[PDB]
């Protein structure tokens, strides 16, 4: 009884979130019509974490979907599992997104803000207990980036104690789908640092790299990319839903990995990812997972850990496995790569074991780590933003909405200070 | 012991009559008289369209 | 008759407990439902009809571990009141389990332990289990001990805790919880036994023959020590030792109480086929550093009083020869003001083996409880780990926000610092 | 044996009452021909409250119908349940309504009033007991607004003890169907404040908003709006007709809800309402009814409670349910939202339970609240009256009927005093 | 022989009485129609042939609740003259149930109760049921006691009233009604017991395992107390306690008479399977704050004399050990000028069950009536609720309009302040 409320914003959030419920529904065993047709009693133990039950044996997810234009919504209901969601949690506007952060924050955000909060209030106050919320959005756009940050303040004001876990997609370095991304990403960062507890950062380029290097997919689509992200979201909350030999929920993760309030940005990775031809050669052992997780290529964010130093690391294991073997690997990897860890924190690796694995896989692992390599990703957007801002640019589109030019300077100042903060703690 | 097992039998019976409520969603939707069905009342045939004002 | 109450806290305490009660129920001859297909009064009570009930309370701040018992095969054995589950765990935070969440459930628990003590006609002590790193194990454990001290007073409260390993660690904030809990334990507890997972891993792989153990095998090993520990109160023996004797015999001062554990023979059933395993053999195997359940070498330090417990076919004549031989061994040191240095007990009932068990059916076995200055090695490692993180204050903000005042952090460090030099003065001789 | 007399005056009142008898007759099981064909003995326990029995098993309602022109009387006569009413109870004039308050109150009202009062008298004196009266009328028209006040003053003169509960519809804030409503409503307010014990205000606009937002009805005719309002009349008096665990009649409600003689205007609501096809997504329980009742959108009057504060509130529950569940819900909603309730009145929420819910629902609820938010509505009509009165404008049509200009100033003076009295008690 | 008259006023009284007479008829063995398929005469009159009629008067100012009995199964049991119904209820208005409406039916009511006592040769008391918040329970109940004081004089008049809950409230004008009825109760009543719905709800959820109770389940609990209360006059035992013994033993002064009630064991089938429930355990269950039927903590104040009643195979030796054990509780405070502190009672007739019941089939049970200064906490609450409303004259117009004078409002406030002075002055140091 540690319920979690799920919020999806924008095109990125709705498609990632829709694929997310396909994963969980099959894990728990819920038919797409919403009825339980499962195979084990353990599934119905703690389905209350994510679902409400409609009288009749029909289970409804705790999902709230937000967008400024209804185009993406009807694409979700056209999906196989779209009938599952409650029709009244569909909250959408009747205006173009604009791909504009200021337009989403000031003009269309305020109109939708009041309606969304009450929809949040229904699901937040319908359960016996509430641990935290779960936000899925991208930062390069205007809808999820703009309105997502505004809702993040209101959630913090009303519900300070609860865990505001957010998952973010960062604009890519090489090829990106929007010109004005440096403006959108820089402004959004100010709200994430002060409001949310936990932030996980995903880069689209690394998702492509994993597909071509490891999975050997000849033609990857956005379905395959979004499938990888859903696994990490599934893994983190698995400790809530199933029994295990060593439990670790969200609040344990925040306490251990976060040493200071502002340093809470994370990278993730998932093992085992097996090539379709290498399956016959790979013998699944616990050390085999350890190799994939700490390998730099497996990281879902295009920031190389070797260029920085680790502060904390966390690994989650799923399946029945030896406790000695898991604990020995954390010692082994820590002691054999000592140059990448900070001296003034001993035992930088946290570990956990959960008993029930994903379907088809007899053992799997999840990795969450915090490192100084993030200075790379923020320096990237800062450089592009400066040149786009030294001369004025598309900026007039934002000024005509109500945003003041001083907000950009404040946006860069806070973003710059977080870069220096990670510089200091490397020493 | 017997009274405990008897007690759980009563609860299962009570949940069955709780789950009957799917019956009265049928009445709520099938309520055409109450115009949750949007009847289009009063014989619209273009000779007239009306028999009862508000209809 | 004579009773003992068992209290289990957190994940470590609970799943150790169901391992122990699996052993006791099999040993005494009672089905998991409480019926039968004596010394029942020491651990059980007789309910309505011929049904029995444990004298145990399971406590945790999260329901996953407790609900495993509720749906398990042993579910009918326990009275539903005994299984106490909180709402949200302590998140490995001492302040969260001591001040904020711990005080939400403390008074409900104290009624149930006190109410169970009313059925305790001849109560003589309690047994309490912890894991130092956990929030509920440390934070709620300290509050439970603090309240229990004024409730009962002159009753022997024995503890059985898992000391964090020298290198194997699962929590980063682990040093913070242990030191803060240490200050609370030292004043209130009568005596607390140390074990660590790292040594139990090595023993269960080297001596006992398993490639890849789990926590399930380790919990069965712990159950043997407690089973032999209480065997004097239950079954006949040539030399009986009560709980109160362990308090007096082992600990020289108030604060130096912490003993360490050992057991012999730990031998797989193929290896047990080779050797006769006489009394002198098992006594010699006790004192090797390999068999110690705490991974600190006693050769670094010296021995004060040790307690030995024999079970099975042992004869008092053979015991005297064995201990006399051990005194001749010059790899074993004793402080000069402990010339006697020993407390021995002999019991007739051999240990009990388990279905799906790992150990052999040996008919003579010995258990050892010894207090040594080699434990001072463990405190320095723990103290060192605390100082590195505290110098830059890596995790103070989490504890302060959950009700702790910062001033408690240097105090627990001071109280540990005194204990560190407390050990050196005792280590000296005149 | 707590009989109630029902009077229908004007177009709005007549059509609402016509639907209102369909609700009762189905709930009791009386055939449209006036004969009993029901299914339960409990229906015949206390049918005497609303009906008279004609020798032969024919049941006749205690209804009196009033209008100034025969148009609506013929409309009801052709209705499905038209034959139910007693033909001698139809009293009407032979002149146009005129949409004039002064004309209805002074010119045509006096000749009709002497006959109407005697029509009341046969039914009021015919029964064993008489607790109160029931009137349905509008407050923007010429017949209901004017003649309803005239009969209310006369009924108070003859029956001082009885409860003169009326049901009124207020002119809408955005779009309304008459040019000269502000004159009509202002003049009527003077009478209702001093003579009627209980007044329930309902807005047409909130009825439409409920229709789209919850009922999804694309074209709501006047049948749906009147049926929704008919639910509230049926709910309030249900405690008299059927047994329950905690009885609460009209006078119990007056003493509880009304703290001072002049603050007795009420806002109403009902739950649950069925979203078409979406009812399969909803698990109806007692906590769910509580969510709708205190949801501000389900209020039938277009005055926002959140902009004001509450003084007293009352909820009825119908069906076999737990009494602890009811009493815990009232406490929960009062403790969680302390800002909207007054300190100098503790326990602001009254509760009640009835055994037999209406047909079609295994449970239902009714909400009645009294709040300072009525100041929004009365400011509306006072403002339109003020800028119309300064120009004089349409007064030309009221003066030529015998109404002095002094009455307009008096009517505003009492209306403004009522607004101030709500202002002062907010402290 | 010996006999008691029961009067039920308002919904909260008659709905409890429905549950009481179910229990009473089934305990003796009389069918609901009044025939048979001893102690019958203390509660029933034998009209002749084979039919029995209760000694009860049902009254409420509105006919809905009473007509349920006239149409229900028990319609054959009662005498129709006993079932009295008014016309229109009191609308939760004291003035309406006391001044205007109350006097219309009072003299008809008094003739029936007096007539019922003529057949009653050995009357020794009355049992009257109220709800303080209700208009009829308070307004008409006051008018009833004022007349019965002169009609019958020095006969003990015991009441069973539902005191308004701290937070759970169903009437807005509830605080006004309690103070007005408090003045009339305090002078005429011999002793009036206190119960409240809020504590019964939590008790009906924790001990008895019911997810969502109704007023029905709470009513069976109160019927058990009265059945245990009156059992000394009906069944054999070892220490009989008469009605007059309650009057002297419980109340030390004239105005401190209000007690609180408790019962044990209240347990479900599954828990009673595990618990032994001997005399020592049930005596310990009484003194916990959870089992109190009034949601007030006894630890806030101190105890005056308490009365204990035991029903079952209970031996006097165990009773003395239990209370001596209770006196060893330092968490229980007793006032020094009551060193005696207790009266005991034992009876052999065990508790009785009901089809479709909620309770377990225990062999013994104990009922407790306690007098304490802790309920002074309850009065200061109700006084404060009154102060906020009357400061702004919140509901005076309704009461004054129905014949009530405003001058009674300060006077009733004045008498309550004297009662508040009397309690802590009693609780003051020796
Ligand atoms: N020997 C042994 N140790 C265990 C077992 N399970 C957990 N531990 C140890 O317990 C420590 C972690 O603390 P927890 O067991 O989770 O205790 P806790 O009080 O429940 O911690 P919280 O989850 O915060 O409540 C780790 O060092 C583990 O090594 C077990 O089954 N056997
Ligand atoms: N235990 C119990 N309490 C009840 C029952 N019915 C009502 N009450 C309590 O009675 C209190 C209010 O008193 P009323 O219900 O108004 O009784 P009354 O004396 O008849 O008052 P009027 O109806 O106005 O004449 C509430 O707080 C309820 O908790 C019942 O069936 N059982
Ligand atoms: N990983 C991933 N990225 C996506 C998906 N759909 C869109 N994107 C990318 O997300 C970025 C921002 O999307 P956008 O439409 O601006 O989202 P919004 O403004 O918040 O509604 C674009 O560059 C897209 O290429 C998806 O399904 N998965
Ligand atoms: N709810 C409801 N309102 C109506 C109906 N018919 C008319 N009205 C409204 O009632 C208001 C005034 O009615 P009116 O015809 O002047 O009543 P009159 O006083 O008898 O003449 C108008 O603004 C209409 O919008 C109906 O059937 N239902
Ligand atoms: Mg725990
Ligand atoms: Mg009443």
Q: Give φ, ψ of C73 to 5 degrees.
A: -65, -30
The β-bridge partners of D366 are D270, D316
Closest alpha carbon to D243 in E155, A185, E18, C382:
E18
Radius of gyration from C-alpha coordinates of chain D: 21
Kindly identify which residue of chain A lies nearest to residue B23, measuring between CA atoms. Answer: A56
C-beta separation of C136 from C97 below 8 A: yes
The ligand 4 atom at the shortest distance from the C-alpha of residue D97 is 21
Q: Contact E272/C81, CB-based, under 8 Å?
A: no
Give the relative orientation of helices E376-391 and E408-427 as an angle to the nearest 10 degrees. Answer: 150
Classify C4 as helix, strand or coil: strand
C-alpha angle with apex C289: C284 to C290, nearest 5 degrees?
90
Strands E157-162 and E123-131: parallel
Residue A35 DSSP class: B
C-alpha angle with apex A372: A366 to A373, nearest 5 degrees?
75
C-beta separation of D95 from D68 below 8 A: yes
Does residue E354 have a cis peptide bond before it, meaning omega lies within 30 degrees of 0?
Answer: no
C-beta separation of D2 from D131 below 8 A: yes
Instruction: Output the CA D355–ligand 2 centroid distance in Å.
Output: 16
CA distance D18 to D32: 12
Chains that touch A (3 or more CB pairs under 8 A): B, C, D
CA distance E134 to B15: 35
Strands C83-85 and C56-60: parallel
Classify C372 as helix, strand or coil: strand
Per DSSP (E only), the strands in B1-55 are none
CA distance D424 to E15: 43
Look-up of token digits 């603090």: C146
Closest alpha carbon to C391 in A342, D236, E307, E283:
A342
In order of C20, C107, C143, C393, E82, the CA distances from C138 in angstroms are 21, 17, 9, 20, 67
Beta-carbon contacts of residue C284 (< 8 Å; ≥ 6 apart): C325, C326
Beta-carbon contacts of residue D294 (< 8 Å; ≥ 6 apart): D333, D367
CA distance D303 to D201: 10
Q: Where are the alpha helices (DSSP H) in C136-214?
A: 141-152, 174-188, 197-206
Tokens found for residue C10 = 């957190």
CA distance E286 to E339: 20
Among partner residues D254, D260, D325, which is closest to E212 by beta-carbon distance? D325
CA distance A341 to A347: 10
C-alpha angle with apex A341: A337 to A342, nearest 5 degrees?
150
Instruction: Output the CA A253–ligand 5 centroid distance in Å.
Output: 15
Look-up of token digits 């004022």: E146
Contacts of B7 in chain E (CB under 8 A): 268-269
Q: Which helix (H) or strand (E) holds C416?
A: helix C408-427
Task: Give the active site residue among E245, E275, E408, E420.
Answer: E245
Tokens found for residue E375 = 């309920």
How many Å from the N-terminal Cα to the C-terminal Cα in chain A?
Answer: 42
Q: Where are the alpha helices (DSSP H) in D173-285?
A: 181-195, 204-210, 222-236, 238-241, 250-257
Closest alpha carbon to E160 in E214, E187, E133, E196:
E196
Chain center to CA of E313: 26
One DSSP character per residue, E277-338 reads: --HHHHHHHHTSTTT-SSS--GGGS-EEEEEEEEEES--HHHHHHHHHHHHT-TTS-B-TT-
CA atoms within 13 A on the CB side of C265: 24
The β-bridge partners of D7 are D64, D135
Number of Cβ within 10 Å of residue E205's Cβ equals 14
Closest alpha carbon to D132 in D167, D168, D166, D164:
D164
Tell me, using a 6 A CB cutoff, whether residue D13 lines ligand 4: no
CA atoms within 13 A on the CB side of A286: 21
CA distance A156 to A120: 13
Tokens found for residue C93 = 């935070």
The ligand 4 atom at the shortest distance from the C-alpha of residue D171 is 23
The β-bridge partners of E366 are E264, E310
Tokens found for residue C225 = 């020590």
* Residues A156/A158/A159/A163 CA torsion (nearest 10 deg): -20
Query: Is the Cβ of B55 closer than 8 Å to some Cβ of chain D?
Result: yes
Tokens found for residue E158 = 């015991």
Chains that touch E (3 or more CB pairs under 8 A): B, C, D
HEC profile of chain D: CCCEEEEEEHHHHHHHHHHHHHHHHHHHCECCCCEECCCCHHHHCCHHHCEEEECCCEEEECEEEEECCCHHHHHHHCCCCHHHCCHHHEEECCCCCCCCHHHHHHHHHHHHHHHHHHHHHHHHHHCCCCCEEEEEEECCCCHHHHHHHHHHHHHHHHCCCCEEEEEEEECCCCCCCCCCHHHHHHHHHHHHHHHCCEEEEEEHHHHHHHHHHHHCCCCCCHHHHHHHHHHHHHHHCHHHHCCCCECCCHHHHHHHHCCCCCCCEEEEEEECCCCCCHHHHCCCCHHHHHHHHCCHHHCCCCCCHHHCCEEEEEEEEECCCCHHHHHHHHHHHHHHCHHHECCCCCCCEEEEEECCCCCCCCCEEEEEEEECCHHHHHHHHHHHHHHHHHCCCCHHHHHCCCCCCHHHHHHHHHHHHHHHHHHHCCC
HEC profile of C373-407: CCHHHHHHHHHHHHHHHHHCCCCHHHHHHCCCCCC
Give the relative orientation of helices D374-390 and D406-424 as an angle to the nearest 10 degrees. Answer: 150
Classify D426 as helix, strand or coil: coil
Long-range contacts of E116-120 (CB under 8 A, 24+ apart): E116/E5, E116/E55, E116/E57, E116/E82, E117/E5, E119/E45, E120/E3, E120/E5, E120/E55
Q: Which helix (H) or strand (E) holds C215?
A: helix C215-234
Q: Give φ, ψ of A397 to 5 degrees.
A: -65, -35
Per DSSP (E only), the strands in C164-252 are 191-195
C-beta separation of C268 from C206 below 8 A: no
Kindly identify which residue of chain D lies nearest to residue E202, measuring between CA atoms. Answer: D324
Instruction: Output the CA A359–ligand 5 centroid distance in Å.
Output: 28
Closest alpha carbon to C386 in C423, C412, C419:
C412
Q: Which helix (H) or strand (E) holds A208?
A: helix A204-210
Closest alpha carbon to C96 in C146, C149, C143:
C143
C-beta separation of A363 from A356 below 8 A: no
Query: Is the Cβ of C89 closer than 8 Å to some Cβ of chain A?
Result: yes
Closest alpha carbon to D247 in E92, E72, E71:
E92
Tokens found for residue A362 = 């007899």
CA distance D67 to D91: 7
Chain center to CA of A375: 19
Closest alpha carbon to D252 in D163, D374, D327:
D163
In order of A201, A216, A229, A297, E249, the CA distances from A220 in angstroms are 21, 9, 14, 18, 89
CA distance E288 to E383: 27
Tell me, using a 6 A CB cutoff, whether residue A158 lines ligand 3: no
Tokens found for residue E419 = 């009662």
Beta-carbon contacts of residue A395 (< 8 Å; ≥ 6 apart): A183, A389, A405, A408
In order of A44, A60, A86, C17, D18, the CA distances from A52 in angstroms are 12, 5, 10, 35, 41
Look-up of token digits 């955000």: A109
Beta-carbon contacts of residue D167 (< 8 Å; ≥ 6 apart): D16, D134, D135, D136, D137, D200, D202, D229, D232, D233
Strands A90-92 and A63-67: parallel
Beta-carbon contacts of residue E380 (< 8 Å; ≥ 6 apart): E420
Classify D310 as helix, strand or coil: strand
CA distance E422 to E415: 10
In order of A100, C104, C214, the CA distances from C62 in angstroms are 45, 13, 22
Instruction: Output the CA C219–ligand 1 centroid distance in Å.
Output: 12
CA atoms within 13 A on the CB side of C152: 25
Radius of gyration from C-alpha coordinates of chain B: 23
Burial group, residue A406, by CB count within 10 angstroms (0-12, 13-18, 19+)? exposed
The β-bridge partners of A366 are A270, A316
Tell me, using a 6 A CB cutoff, whether residue E89 lines ligand 2: yes
C-beta separation of D351 from E170 below 8 A: yes
The β-bridge partners of C307 are C343, C369
Burial group, residue A281, by CB count within 10 angstroms (0-12, 13-18, 19+)? exposed
Contacts of E275 in chain C (CB under 8 A): 47-48, 79
The β-bridge partners of C99 are none
Contacts of C392 in chain A (CB under 8 A): 344
Burial group, residue E342, by CB count within 10 angstroms (0-12, 13-18, 19+)? middle
C-beta separation of B3 from D250 below 8 A: no
C-beta separation of A23 from A80 below 8 A: no
Burial group, residue A228, by CB count within 10 angstroms (0-12, 13-18, 19+)? buried
CA distance A47 to A37: 14
CA distance A28 to A22: 10
- Number of residues that make up chain A: 427
Number of Cβ within 10 Å of residue E378's Cβ equals 20
CA distance D120 to D150: 14
Chain center to CA of A331: 28
Does residue D272 have a cis peptide bond before it, meaning omega lies within 30 degrees of 0?
Answer: yes
Query: Is the Cβ of A53 closer than 8 Å to some Cβ of chain B?
Result: no
Radius of gyration from C-alpha coordinates of chain A: 21
CA distance A361 to C140: 38
Contacts of E170 in chain D (CB under 8 A): 246, 327, 350-352
Look-up of token digits 């099981």: D29
In order of D47, D49, D130, E164, the CA distances from D245 in angstroms are 20, 20, 24, 17
Strands D51-54 and D310-318: unpaired
């Amino acid at each position: 009884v540690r319920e979690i409320v799920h919020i999806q914003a924008g095109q990125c959030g709705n498609q990632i979130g829709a694929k997310f419920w396909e994963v969980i529904s099959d894990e728990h065993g819920i038919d797409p019509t919403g009825s339980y047709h499962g195979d084990s009693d353990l599934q119905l133990e703690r389905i209350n974490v994510y679902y409400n039950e409609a009288t009749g044996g029909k289970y409804v997810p705790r999902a709230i979907l937000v967008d400024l234009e209804p185009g993406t919504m009807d694409s979700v209901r056209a999906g196989q599992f779209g009938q599952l969601f409650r029709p009244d949690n569909f909250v959408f506007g009747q205006s173009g997104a604009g791909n504009n952060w200021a337009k989403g924050y000031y003009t269309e955000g305020q109109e939708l803000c009041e309606s969304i909060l009450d929809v949040i209030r229904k699901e937040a106050e319908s359960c016996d207990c509430l641990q935290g919320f779960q936000l899925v959005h991208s930062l390069g756009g205007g809808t999820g980036a703009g309105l997502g940050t505004l809702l993040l303040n209101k959630l913090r004001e009303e519900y300070p104690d609860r865990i505001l876990s957010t998952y973010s997609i960062v604009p890519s370095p090489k090829v990106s789908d929007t010109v004005v991304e440096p403006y959108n990403c820089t402004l959004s960062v100010h709200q994430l640092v002060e409001s949310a507890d936990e932030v996980f950062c995903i880069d689209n380029e690394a998702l492509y790299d994993i597909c071509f290097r490891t999975l050997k997919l000849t033609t990857p689509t956005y379905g395959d990319l979004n499938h990888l992200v859903s696994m990490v979201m599934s893994g983190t909350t698995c400790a809530l839903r199933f029994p295990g030999q060593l439990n670790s929920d969200l609040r344990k993760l925040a306490v251990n990995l976060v040493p200071f309030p502002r340093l809470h940005f994370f990278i993730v990775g998932f093992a085992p990812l097996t090539s379709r031809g290498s399956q016959q050669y790979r013998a699944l052992t616990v050390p085999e997972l350890t190799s994939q997780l700490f390998d730099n290529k497996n990281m879902m964010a295009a920031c190389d850990p070797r260029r920085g130093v680790y502060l904390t690391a966390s690994a989650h294991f799923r399946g029945r496995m030896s406790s000695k073997e898991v604990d020995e690997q954390m010692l082994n990897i820590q002691a054999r790569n000592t140059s990448y860890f900070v001296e003034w924190i001993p035992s930088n690796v946290k570990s956990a074991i959960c008993d029930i694995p994903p379907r088809g896989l007899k053992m799997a692992a999840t990795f969450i780590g915090n490192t100084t390599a993030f200075r790379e990703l923020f320096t990237r957007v800062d450089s592009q933003f400066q040149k786009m801002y030294a001369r004025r640019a598309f900026i007039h589109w934002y000024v005509n909405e109500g945003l003041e030019t001083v907000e950009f300077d404040e946006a860069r100042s806070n973003m710059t200070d977080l870069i220096q903060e990670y510089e200091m703690y490397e020493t | 012991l017997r009274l405990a097992a008897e007690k759980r039998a009563r609860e299962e019976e009570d949940r069955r009559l709780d789950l009957e409520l799917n019956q009265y969603e049928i009445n709520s939707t099938i309520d055409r008289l109450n115009q949750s069905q949007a009847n289009d009342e009063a014989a619209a045939a273009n000779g007239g369209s009306f028999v009862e004002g508000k209809r | 008759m004579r009773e003992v109450i068992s209290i289990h806290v957190g994940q470590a305490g609970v799943q150790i407990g169901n391992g122990c009660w699996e052993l006791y129920c099999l040993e005494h001859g009672i089905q998991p439902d409480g019926q039968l297909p004596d010394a029942f009064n020491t651990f059980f009570s007789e309910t309505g009809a011929g049904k029995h009930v444990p004298r145990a309370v399971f406590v945790d701040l999260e329901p996953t571990v407790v609900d495993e018992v509720r749906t398990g095969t042993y579910r009918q054995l326990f009275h539903p009141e005994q299984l106490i589950s909180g709402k949200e765990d302590a998140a490995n935070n001492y302040a969260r389990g001591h001040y904020t969440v711990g005080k939400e459930i403390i008074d409900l628990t104290l009624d149930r332990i006190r109410k169970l003590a009313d059925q305790c006609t001849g109560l003589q002590g309690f047994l309490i289990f912890h894991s130092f790193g956990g929030g509920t194990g440390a934070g709620f454990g300290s509050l439970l001990l603090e309240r229990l001290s004024v409730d009962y007073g002159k009753k022997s409260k024995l503890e059985f805790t898992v000391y964090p390993s020298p290198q194997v660690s699962t929590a980063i904030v682990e040093p913070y919880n242990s030191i803060l809990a240490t200050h609370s334990m030292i004043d209130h507890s009568d005596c607390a036994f140390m074990v660590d997972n790292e040594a139990l891993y090595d023993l269960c792989r080297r001596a006992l023959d398993i490639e890849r153990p789990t926590y399930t095998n380790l919990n069965r090993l712990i159950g043997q020590v407690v089973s032999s520990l209480t065997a004097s109160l239950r079954f006949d023996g040539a030399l009986n030792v009560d709980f109160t004797e362990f308090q007096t015999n082992l600990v020289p001062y108030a604060r130096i109480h912490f003993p360490i554990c050992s057991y012999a023979p730990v031998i797989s059933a193929e290896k047990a086929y080779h050797e006769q395993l006489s009394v002198a053999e098992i006594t010699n195997s006790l004192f090797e550093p390999a068999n110690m359940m705490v991974k600190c070498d006693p050769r670094h330090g010296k021995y004060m009083a040790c307690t030995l417990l024999y079970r099975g076919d042992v004869v008092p004549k053979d015991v005297s020869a064995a201990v006399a031989t051990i005194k001749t061994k010059r790899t074993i040191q004793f402080v000069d003001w402990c010339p006697t240095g020993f407390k021995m007990g002999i019991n007739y009932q051999p240990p009990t083996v388990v279905p799906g068990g790992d150990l052999a059916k040996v008919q003579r076995a010995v258990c050892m409880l010894a207090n040594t200055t080699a434990i001072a090695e463990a405190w320095s490692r723990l103290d060192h780990k605390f100082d590195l993180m505290y110098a830059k204050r890596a995790f103070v903000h989490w504890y302060v926000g959950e009700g702790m005042e910062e001033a408690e952090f240097p105090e627990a460090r001071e109280d540990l610092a005194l204990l560190e030099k407390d050990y050196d003065e005792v280590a000296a001789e005149s």
